[PDB]
């Protein structure tokens, strides 16, 4: 496990908080970073993230062992699971249906991480001259950017910008895209909901984080940078440290 602390806010342009997540932990104290962004769009979006957030602390406190060359197939099959079971909850209720929302998970070991993901919140890697997104944005805008019809920045201000493309809930099926990183040679994980990197550059997040300071220290400055930009949105992350491996 890593030194990691998750932060949220709903913003200063919200009702409600729909962002969810949380750092948990299974019988041997393996460790897990979740973190899920509800749809705004829909109902219930508090629901959704919520949902997901609690059936992967359930199912994993429930786990002894996730050993690194079973947690790909561990994250696929239990996000599969939760998507299926929450379509399932939303059709089943009037008052969530069309519910839904984001997914970023990662499982740590000693010298990597294994991450799923559906939708537009984000993992990512950094040290002292690199930050490097892991995941792909599954945004209408992402593909549009793809695939060369508009530019990276015009996505910012695109009328259909927030919409997304993949997202748990709104069907009976999912694939999640699984990737397997190496943390050598870096220094933090970041997972984020969109309301952070919707308004706080990739450069920006290097360069604060290159500072000296606790994870409290980074984390609350990165949060106050965010609400500075004015985000629109909840504003989520979590911040783990990642320990150079000793002499
Ligand atoms: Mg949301
Ligand atoms: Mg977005
Ligand atoms: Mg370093
Ligand atoms: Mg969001």
New binding site residues.
């Given amino acids: 496990h890593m030194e990691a602390q998750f932060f949220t806010d709903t913003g200063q342009h919200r009702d409600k908080n729909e962002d969810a997540g949380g750092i948990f932990y299974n019988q041997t104290n393996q460790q897990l970073l979740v973190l899920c962004d509800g749809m705004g769009g829909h109902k219930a979006g508090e629901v959704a993230s919520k949902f997901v957030t609690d059936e992967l602390k359930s199912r994993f406190e429930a786990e002894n062992l996730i050993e690194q060359h079973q947690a790909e197939n561990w994250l696929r099959n239990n996000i599969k699971d939760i998507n299926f079971q929450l379509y399932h909850y939303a059709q089943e209720n009037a008052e969530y249906k069309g519910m839904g929302t984001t997914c970023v998970c990662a499982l740590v070991f000693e010298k990597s991480v294994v991450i799923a993901n559906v939708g537009?919140s984000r993992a990512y890697v950094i040290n002292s001259r690199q930050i490097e997104q892991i995941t792909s944005?599954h945004?209408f805008v992402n593909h549009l950017v793809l695939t060369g019809q508009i530019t990276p920045e015009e996505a910012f201000t695109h009328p259909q910008?927030?919409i997304?493309t993949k997202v748990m809930g709104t069907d009976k099926r999912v694939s999640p895209d699984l990737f397997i990183k190496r943390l050598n040679f870096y220094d933090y994980l970041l997972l984020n909901s969109?309301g952070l990197t919707?308004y706080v550059k990739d450069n920006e997040i290097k360069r604060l984080l290159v500072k000296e300071g606790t994870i409290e220290d980074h984390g609350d400055q990165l949060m106050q940078l965010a609400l500075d930009n004015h985000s629109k949105d909840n504003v989520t992350f979590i911040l783990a440290a990642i320990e150079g491996d000793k002499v």
């Fill in positions: 537009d944005d945004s910008k927030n997304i969109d919707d």
